[PDB]
Amino acid sequence: VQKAHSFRRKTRKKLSKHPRRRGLPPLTRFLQEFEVGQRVHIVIEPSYHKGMPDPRFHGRTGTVVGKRGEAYIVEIKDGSKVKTLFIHPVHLRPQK
Amino acid sequence: LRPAKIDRYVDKPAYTRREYIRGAPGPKITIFDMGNPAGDFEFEVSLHTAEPVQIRQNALEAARQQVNRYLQKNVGRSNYHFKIRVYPFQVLRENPMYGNGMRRPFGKPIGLAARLKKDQKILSIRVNRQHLKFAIEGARRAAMKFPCKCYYRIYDKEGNDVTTKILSQ
RNA sequence: GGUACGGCGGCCAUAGCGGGGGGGCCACACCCGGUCUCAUUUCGAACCCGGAAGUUAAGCCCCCCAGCGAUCCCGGUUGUACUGCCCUCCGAGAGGGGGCGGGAAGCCGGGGACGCCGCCGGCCA
RNA sequence: CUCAGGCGGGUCAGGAAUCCGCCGUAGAGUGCAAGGGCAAAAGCCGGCCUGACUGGACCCGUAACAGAGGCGGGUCCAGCCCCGAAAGGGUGGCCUAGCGAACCCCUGUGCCUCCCCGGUGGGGGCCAGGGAUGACAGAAAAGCUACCCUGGGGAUAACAGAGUCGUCUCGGGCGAGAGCCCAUAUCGACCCCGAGGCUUGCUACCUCGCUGUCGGCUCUUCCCAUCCUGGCCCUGCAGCAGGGGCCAAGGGUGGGGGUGUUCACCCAUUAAAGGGGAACGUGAGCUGGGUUUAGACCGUCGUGAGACAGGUCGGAUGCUAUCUACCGGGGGUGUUGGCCGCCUGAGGGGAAGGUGCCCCUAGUACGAGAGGAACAGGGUGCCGCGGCCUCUGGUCUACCGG
RNA sequence: CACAGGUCCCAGCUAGCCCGAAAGGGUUUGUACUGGGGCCGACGCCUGCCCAGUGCCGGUAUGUGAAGCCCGGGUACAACCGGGUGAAGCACCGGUAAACGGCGGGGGUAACUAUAACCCUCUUAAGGUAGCGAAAUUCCUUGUCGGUUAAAUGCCGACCUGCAUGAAUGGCGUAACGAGGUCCCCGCUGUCCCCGGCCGGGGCCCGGCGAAACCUCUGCCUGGCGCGCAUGCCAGGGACC
């Protein structure tokens, strides 16, 4: 039986957390800052449910191209299409 | 009862989650320890399988019964420890087939079997020096009831292989 | 510059749990009393207001351990289990094997580990 | 503020009423399925409130890559607000389900508009919310066809063919046990490994611009897992007979009753009255009893037309042999010139033979007895084959007679 | 199928039934011993219960019920809204089964063992009466018993357990009748054991007239490959025309 894709489809392990990492994460990831042109990895924090990108884009690396509110505008290349996402800094990590 | 060659092989995935398997049958083998489990026995004859095999609970029960009868007759209840080291977990199913064929062909449970790996011990008979020949004969009789090639080895208390050493003299 | 002093943090168990010894210049506490501020779906037990008669008994601070938990290094199991590419290699079949490239988990033995580190201030000098 | 559960202690009070202390990483709870997340909370108990709001942007998903009406979600700007000391939080439910185009209609709210102008009643238009299409990207909708018709499909069933052997038939390994003892004279549990394609099934690979079905008759041929006939081994084989097994396919394996039957059952004989393959051999060989059209009756089901792998009566079988095939009959060439005659036999075909009974051995061997063989030697029947018309019978459209 | 016979329904004439667009018309130069419309189907004995369901007929107090008409609102007039009157038809009541069709189930049953037969009671209208029954109806089925045969999935008689018989879509019986289906007996016979002779017409040869169906080209086999059953392909065998 075909199943359509939803936000939490097949995310039992991808969006799970380590048992020893249960609770609030350290505030550094929440309060980190980025600059235009910087490249950041998309690593979702399951506890924070706001500003979360689609899990299909988890683990990719994107380019910051602006900012709106408290969310960063991240551009990715899915195949040959440019996709723009609004991701909270808690779901982001600097490259290197 | 269908031929055992249908289930002898382990190509299919493991099917042992009773929480989600509906109508899974209850075991037909209930005794796994016999003789004197706490006895102090010098030697242990273990029967290993040569290939990864699935042994049906029917075959396990038949081997248990015949080996136990032989051991009781020729050794004595207080002079051996016959143990089966594997429990049947895999659930054997069958296609439930006026009368459709291959339509909705997922099978319904029909039996149980134990899945083993290469060079895995199936059963162990602990005995003293005198009853080693009887233990070997019982192991051979058990092996004759299984769907694969099996061999036997003799170990001391520590676990060293001394089969040739002992059987030679 | 010292200090078995405190406040705000970083990594978030190699830092935890459980034990042993040591301390009261200042500082942190226990604690004396509830008119005023505040509160009990009763209780000044907590929270809050007012202080020093006593105490270092313990929170706290200094030092130590390897019982549990965690986790880093080395040696054995072992280049074992498993696996990417090629194959006119074997096997009745299941499946295995050769060449080049990767490589565990668990267990055993010997060490490590009873946390590092940053900003500021108090007291003394 | 901290749960579920547990431990020790308490008047009624016990397993469970209501309490007190300790342990307790969540083993509780969330409005609801599952997954994930939540412990000075997102859980429990309280205070206030309505942001479950108005005017709009950009982006992700349904729908990766890679197009989308509708729908859901995320990040924001402004307005008016809620909570809080403040930071900060609020565009419903901790995240993922609980729902839906066009046309038409109802409601709110302000504006535009109705054919030469102006007023009134009424109509039309823009924006927002609502009434549903579950076949859920949105026709309003019951059946028979056996009187059927058309276009196709081997993209798709029934018979047959092909693959497989679950099932079917037939073997093997081990040996618990039954056999006075004795596992293997015979049977052989519980288990396990195989062979054939002779039952049924599964698949849908060839065949739907057509390959005619079951059964019977006629005829040909082949396999052995052998029923009898030939020769042997073990025996719980005294003889006569039995049980198990081996080599062996030259020959035989027949006649009848009911039934369309194959099959199965039964009768009298027999040495036996074996199982199968050949497009379930054989309809350009036959028959047409069964099956499967068109007529009709009964039972049951349906309001009905009708239906029934339920009975029952009737219901068509086309052929001038093109090639090859086998059966017999002829004309040529070649075989180092032609012709007449008699031979040889490389090869092919055969069953040219098969099988009962009777007399003696012999009422002997064997055996307590009953009962009862064999080697050898003679006779003859039946089935099959190849010939003949002296005898017997048919015919004798020559012939003679009534 | 029809048929004579049985029985039911409509109709007193400008009727009942029917053709048609209408005008007019058929039954009708007719008149209930008649015209029209269904079902069964000579003849003999008979045809039981049920009106809840569907249908038909009569009543219709009462509810609903279209247009038209009336009243009030609205419109300088209408459109429009509310109410009153309200036929037929439905709701409602009754008759009607030789109208369509139905005629089960348990609680039970006891006395002898089965049997249960009379017999009492509830779900909905009633619970199959007289007859017939393994039947053109019976699944199990080749039911069981008896006769017929040496042998009987047949036929005849009986039993009742009627999957799923039945009274006018009639039940049962029936003399005579039948190119209807079905079983048995005497006799007869080449149907058969088991086939053999003979007659005439074809077949065959010779002289004439003289086509058509059909036709990719061709045309030997065994075991294989292949779209899985090949004269043509592969390896072999054989073969003068």
Added chain:
RNA sequence: CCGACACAGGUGCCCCUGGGUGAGAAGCCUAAGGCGUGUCGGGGGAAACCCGGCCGAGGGAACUCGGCAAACUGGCCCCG
């Protein structure tokens, strides 16, 4: 004449039928009338086989789904 035909069908069996046997307008033979044009001829132990016909010892349905086909009886008088 119709059926495409010098078609074994249909139309038209629409009107009539000497002698013998015989109940008979039956079957058979024959007179009148007609024909040899229901139109290709010839050959032959010259077969097998097919279609029409006759017979067949002993048995008498053993055949077959089923006595299909054929055979048995057969007219008249008397009894019954």
Added chain:
RNA sequence: CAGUUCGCUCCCGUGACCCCGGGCUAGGGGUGAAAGGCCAAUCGAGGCCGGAGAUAGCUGGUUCCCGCCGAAUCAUCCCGCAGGAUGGCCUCCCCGGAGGUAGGCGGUGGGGUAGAGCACUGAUUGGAGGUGCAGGGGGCGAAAGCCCCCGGCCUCCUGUCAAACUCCGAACCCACCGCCGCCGUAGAUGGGGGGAGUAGGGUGGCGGUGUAAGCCGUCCACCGAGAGGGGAACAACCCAGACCGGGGUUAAGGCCCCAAAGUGCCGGCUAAGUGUUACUCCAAAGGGUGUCCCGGGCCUUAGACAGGUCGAGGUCCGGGGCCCCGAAAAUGGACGGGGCUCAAGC
């Protein structure tokens, strides 16, 4: 003879009988002793002409040559499933101007599969210890109660598991950055426009399902849409990707004859015509002092076994290679054939 006939046999033959001439009933109509029968060889709705060249997603056909590039049968939607639309994949033309990334090395991130394991959730044999636990049943006692067991629940040991388990966890895959390599100013990545075809796929490896065949996806290698050289023929297997005329060397593989190339060389094995099979085709469990070997043993060269006397090696065990039995089918026959035994087998 005949688009319904002929022969024998059979039925009615004074009646509801048979036939003839003149008339009437005409197509959703007539007529019908009811068979959907008959109505001019036509009847479940006649014939003729017209609408009409009706329509169909279904079947068939579509005509000259060479040259260049060259697919697809997979995603969403449809009363959609033999049919269409939007995309993906092909081709042709044009604008733009400085980059791009199929492969690789190192780095920064993501993962929870194979394997493994019990630290959670659910399963699992036995033993030991602790708990009166609504267990439960007995001894014990008028009754309240104790003493026994068995069971339930915890810790440990022992022996086992998981597609809907995970304290751990690869190979490997993906995103991005630097570089090597390659492509690109003879114009790539990219953008615009015109024209399509494709919506049945098959073989092969892997995954779920099924007794199996098979069905359903996935990998893009080969046929489809592909020549040549081989596997005996063979779609798919091996070499190999091909303009035309010549010369040479090699690939797959092959060398006893068919048939080009060795009756080639050394060491060993097989006695079964086993085999003469890379894969498309290939028989098992179980057994063999049959042979050739390896490794462990106990006795062990006047002493070990076979039968207290001889007087040289025995007696076991676990394995490896080849072979043997287990092994029955239908037209006569299949290592491709002949045939092959220090080989022409392995």
Added chain:
RNA sequence: AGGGAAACCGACAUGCCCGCAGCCGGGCUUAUGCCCGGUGAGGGGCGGGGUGCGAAAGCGCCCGGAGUCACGGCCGCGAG
């Protein structure tokens, strides 16, 4: 001269930045060619403007002049 359902309102003849071809100047290069610096039509991007929704912000469409006619060809729809 576009925006809007309608009433109706009603825009850059270049303010600025990158920049290919071409042009100019310089260096290497035998030459071609390469590199560097300016100007750069066409191209891209800002800024500003008209109208529709709004309280406004902000967005959609549009604005710094290329269209029109003809011959021939491919394709889509309807007619057989």
Added chain:
RNA sequence: AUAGGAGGGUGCGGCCCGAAAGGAAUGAGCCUCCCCGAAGGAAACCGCGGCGACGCGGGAGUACGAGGGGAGGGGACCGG
């Protein structure tokens, strides 16, 4: 009239035809000799290695080699 394949493809050999359009007496097939030759490429014999099949160094990159040229003899075929 002893021979097997969808009737054809590659190469040549018999028998036959062969004026014109094709070459050719301004020389055809043919015979002899000389030169250069791409990729490729031997052997006689000498020494050595290997149990052996055989190989290594020299001979030698030699003879030969697709093709590209030249000279001599003969005198009518070659292509088709």
